[PDB]
Amino acid sequence: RMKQLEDKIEELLSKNYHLENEIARLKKLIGER
Amino acid sequence: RMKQLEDKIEELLSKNYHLENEIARLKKLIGER
């Protein structure tokens, strides 16, 4: 089912995006003392 | 085209797994920096 696969991709992209945001927060912190 | 979508999912899972490893590595580094 295509919508089911498309939903799964959408869910993984969303996770990916959230993971990148966490990485960006962690690197911001590393930039301070 | 379903195999194409299924491939994309495998590729996003792999990307996401690697981001989780990077997060783990960043948190360790912040704990020792």
Q: How many CB atoms lie within 10 A of CB B6?
A: 13
- What gap in Å lies between CA B9 and CA A14, rounded to an integer? 12
- Choose the closest CB to A23 out of B12, B15, B23: B23
What is the Cα–Cα distance from A32 to A11, expressed in whole angstroms? Answer: 33
Pinpoint the alpha helices (H) of chain A: 2-30
> Residue B20 in 3-state DSSP?
helix
| Yes or no, beta carbons of A30 and B29 under 8 Å apart | yes
As a whole number of angstroms, the distance between CA A27 and CA A4 comes to 35
SS3 B11: helix
Distance separating alpha carbons of residues A9 and B13, to the nearest angstrom: 9
Query: What is the spatial distance between Cα A25 and Cα A22, in angstroms, rounded to a whole number?
Result: 5
Q: Which of A19, A20, A21 should one mutate to test binding to chain B, selecting the residue with the greatest count of B CBs within 10 A?
A: A19
Q: What is the dihedral of CA A28, A16, B21, B32, to 10 degrees?
A: 10
Helix (H, G, I), strand (E, B) or coil at B9: helix
The answer to whether the CB atoms of A23 and B27 lie below 8 A apart is no
- CA–CA–CA angle B8, B2, B11 (5° rounding): 10
